[PDB]
Amino acid sequence: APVPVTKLVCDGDTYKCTAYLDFGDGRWVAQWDTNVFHTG
Amino acid sequence: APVPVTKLVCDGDTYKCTAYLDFGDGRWVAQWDTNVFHTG
Amino acid sequence: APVPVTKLVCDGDTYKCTAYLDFGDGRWVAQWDTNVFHTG
Ligand SMILES: CC(=O)N[C@@H]1[C@@H](O)[C@H](O[C@@H]2O[C@H](CO)[C@@H](O)[C@H](O)[C@H]2NC(C)=O)[C@@H](CO[C@@H]2O[C@@H](C)[C@@H](O)[C@@H](O)[C@@H]2O)O[C@H]1O
Ligand SMILES: CC(=O)N[C@@H]1[C@@H](O)[C@H](O[C@@H]2O[C@H](CO)[C@@H](O)[C@H](O)[C@H]2NC(C)=O)[C@@H](CO[C@@H]2O[C@@H](C)[C@@H](O)[C@@H](O)[C@@H]2O)O[C@H]1O
Numbered sequence: 354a355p356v357p358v359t360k361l362v363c364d365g366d367t368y369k370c371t372a373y374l375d376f377g378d379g380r381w382v383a384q385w386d387t388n389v390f391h392t393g
Numbered sequence: 394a395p396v397p398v399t400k401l402v403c404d405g406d407t408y409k410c411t412a413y414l415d416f417g418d419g420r421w422v423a424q425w426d427t428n429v430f431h432t433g
Numbered sequence: 434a435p436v437p438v439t440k441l442v443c444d445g446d447t448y449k450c451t452a453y454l455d456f457g458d459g460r461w462v463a464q465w466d467t468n469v470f471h472t473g
């Protein structure tokens with residue numbers, strides 16, 4: 354079931370974003386690959 | 394063009410995150426595959 | 434290392450979401466491909 358994201362972070366060493374989820378004991382995350390770059 | 398996200402959810406059954414968008418009739422979403430897992 | 438997201442936007446022309454990061458000079462983003470579609 355869809356559950357809300359309580360905090361979103363991203364990481365330019367791992368090239369992943371991690372979404373902390375509201376569910377159960379509070380220790381579930383969603384995580385996906387991303388590009389990370391400097392604008393301008 | 395980039396539009397704001399009003400709410401972000403993720404789902405450990407479908408392995409998707411869904412971003413509700415502020416645009417048009419209010420019923421547009423962005424969605425992507427994700428990993429979902431327990432930590433700790 | 435993980436850094437906070439300050440703003441999340443998504444774009445139905447590019448089919449990407451972009452996360453502005455709290456890091457460094459403030460001009461780093463994470464960006465990933467997404468589906469974008471109308472619901473209901
Ligand atoms: C002089 C200095 O410290 N420059 C920093 C860059 O080194 C750093 O870019 C990463 O550098 C490592 C090598 O140390 C590479 O393996 C990565 O591929 C580089 N990442 C990117 C996206 O270019 C940048 C960026 O820092 C990274 O991304 C941030 C958003 C954050 O997650 C940091 O923790 C992460 O290291 O920062 C310069 O200051
Ligand atoms: C006893 C009990 O209820 N255990 C729950 C797990 O079943 C559940 O893990 C999912 O289980 C289904 C089969 O029922 C699998 O098809 C999924 O692959 C499992 N998902 C994961 C990520 O392991 C877990 C996790 O719940 C899921 O993810 C949450 C973040 C949330 O989105 C839930 O709605 C979703 O079902 O929870 C245990 O309690």
Ligand SMILES: CC(=O)N[C@@H]1[C@@H](O)[C@H](O[C@@H]2O[C@H](CO)[C@@H](O)[C@H](O)[C@H]2NC(C)=O)[C@@H](CO[C@@H]2O[C@@H](C)[C@@H](O)[C@@H](O)[C@@H]2O)O[C@H]1O
Pocket residue numbers: 394395396414416417421443444445446469470
């Ligand atoms: C009459 C009108 O303006 N209709 C709009 C649609 O054209 C638009 O759908 C995009 O249309 C372009 C060509 O104009 C296509 O290349 C895209 O593939 C279409 N995208 C999608 C997702 O269908 C829709 C949706 O607008 C897009 O997505 C929004 C979330 C936002 O990012 C917009 O800036 C973006 O154009 O909107 C209709 O109103």
